[PDB]
Amino acid sequence: DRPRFSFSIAAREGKARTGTIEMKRGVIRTPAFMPVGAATVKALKPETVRATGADIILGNTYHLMLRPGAERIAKLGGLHSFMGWDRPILTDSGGYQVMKQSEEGVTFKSHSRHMLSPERSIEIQHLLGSDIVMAFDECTPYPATPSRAASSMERSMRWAKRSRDAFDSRKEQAENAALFGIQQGSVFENLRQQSADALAEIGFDGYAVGGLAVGEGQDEMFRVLDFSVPMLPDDKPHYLMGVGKPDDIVGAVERGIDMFDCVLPTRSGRNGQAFTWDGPINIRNARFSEDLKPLDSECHCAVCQKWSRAYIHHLIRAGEILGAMLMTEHNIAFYQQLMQKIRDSISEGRFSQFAQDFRARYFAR
Amino acid sequence: DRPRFSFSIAAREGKARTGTIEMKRGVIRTPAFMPVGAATVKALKPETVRATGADIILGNTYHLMLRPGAERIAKLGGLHSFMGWDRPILTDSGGYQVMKQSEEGVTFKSHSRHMLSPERSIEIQHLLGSDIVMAFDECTPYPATPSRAASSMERSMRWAKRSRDAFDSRKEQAENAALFGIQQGSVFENLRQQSADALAEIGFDGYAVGGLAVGEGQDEMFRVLDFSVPMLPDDKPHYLMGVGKPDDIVGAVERGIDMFDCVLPTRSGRNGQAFTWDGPINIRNARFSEDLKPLDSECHCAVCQKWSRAYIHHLIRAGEILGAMLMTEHNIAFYQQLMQKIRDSISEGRFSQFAQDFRARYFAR
Ligand SMILES: Nc1nc2[nH]cnc2c(=O)[nH]1
Ligand SMILES: Nc1nc2[nH]cnc2c(=O)[nH]1
Ligand SMILES: [Zn+2]
């Protein structure tokens, strides 16, 4: 009864947009942050992930195809049933993480040798029962010569067409899921343009900006976004893969990005870093040992309603699992509250002021 | 408004009893199992601990006096506030875990040298804000000569009197908390009798059987319980410290024990062992990789409502925190459901049949 995929832009401010993606398993409010999930968002039950405000999570073809295996997950009823998350899941395509390359695909050894190709990647994502399927692309190293960036991007575009065809051949997948293409081209405007043109000629439900989670720094990332995002179709979602810190997200939204994923909130949380509106803090630091305030005194999350910095400091220093649980829940909730403030401010025509106020306070520390 | 400590026996069957302990922070249904908590029941939020049915948890003087420190916990508002558990907490006294002994107390080095004595143990437990305070006792090694068991037990009884006096001197503690004595005497009936007599002459709110979590095996433990529990005052709770496996608990209840604590459900859970009515299972075993049944198909816990053996097998093999969370919640819930079945069967006059049926199925596997 519900739409397969319908993106609607409710409001804009500059290049920023806010809206919704309606899918069969739920609505995704944009700009959106996707928590990253080995068939788990680390240290969180799915109900807790949802309680933080997340509408969609990310799963990884590369990990799940090895453990527990794609056919096995399908036999067990699909990834949603397996992990107990009934809302949308976006799966990355696997070629990027895994990085022997050839025109056919990539061969690799598990940490046993396996192969991935556009066709196999689409099939794996089908067996998992993904809602948003990513085209199978190639990682371009950074830095790269223009010529190597070009040949990598061109192979990715041929693989994008193969991904489109494989997805469209599987009628249940094409009826129930969406397919996103991935723009490549390293930091080079002409290659980014050729990549955007190729992807739009194939046609996708959404367009990711790939190849920018590669250590280039925020200034260069923003420079590339400045020219790259306008090349993508305006009427489809724009997904910046693997980004990022809170300020990266704000600046990327200012440049027209609608969707994000990053391991930072989960990974940092486990390692004692909590995100706050006054910047990140390292909860293991001695200065928190008697601090009865919550991690952030404006955060609405359940952790900040119930436990102090002092307690969480104690747990993390003791290596206690509950410490990782509480830090991760707070960090994912912080990211979701950031996205909510972004959405509300764009809707209300005050996103420019929000971004300025956010940066002033976040970097004052 | 609520009672400091009121034990009522509602029903009996043989030596088994069922009833309630009313305290200021809540009611404890007996026979009771206390999950063990570094100011956390490992991998569980307090609300989850409560959702499993637990009425009371155990905390440890020895660990908390070093990390984060007893004065520090008191400055932060007490252990209940610090960890977010508002119901009763029983604290062990520290002398046992820590095991230089003298009549004054025990000196030890942290894994810095510290001292514990009856007076300091009571003070630490006061600073933590414990509801049930344990007398400061000595660990008798197993095996022990009769003479060494006697001298150890006698020192423990002198320390029990010092514990009583220190507790009674602190009027807020004596008004709001309860004090339990600990019977010692190794495996020797005459020493167990002398110990029970000394404790009853001092007078306590409850009586623990100490010195039986020492590797003697179930047959010998039961033999000692057979004569030791009847020596304790009938009208106060009987607490078997550090026990045990499900069958240990059932047999100990048959011998008049009302309260238990053990790390098994939490520790085993993290290491992949799940308790079921058909005995323990090792969820990492290959036989569970495609098993869509829950950990136990009769268990009422939230884990068994929502996730399969196959998923939990995957999580534990992957080293995922959620695996430890789910295993621990299920195991603590299993223990609580065991206690509930024990309480109901005693109340209904069918505990003998329950124990027989339980053992037949648990050991059939
Ligand atoms: N498939 C894919 N995933 C990514 N995650 C971060 N960057 C990328 C990329 O370029 N491609
Ligand atoms: N204090 C104390 N704690 C225990 N836990 C298990 N056995 C004992 C004991 O004999 N004394
Ligand atoms: Zn928070």
Ligand SMILES: [Zn+2]
């Ligand atoms: Zn269960």
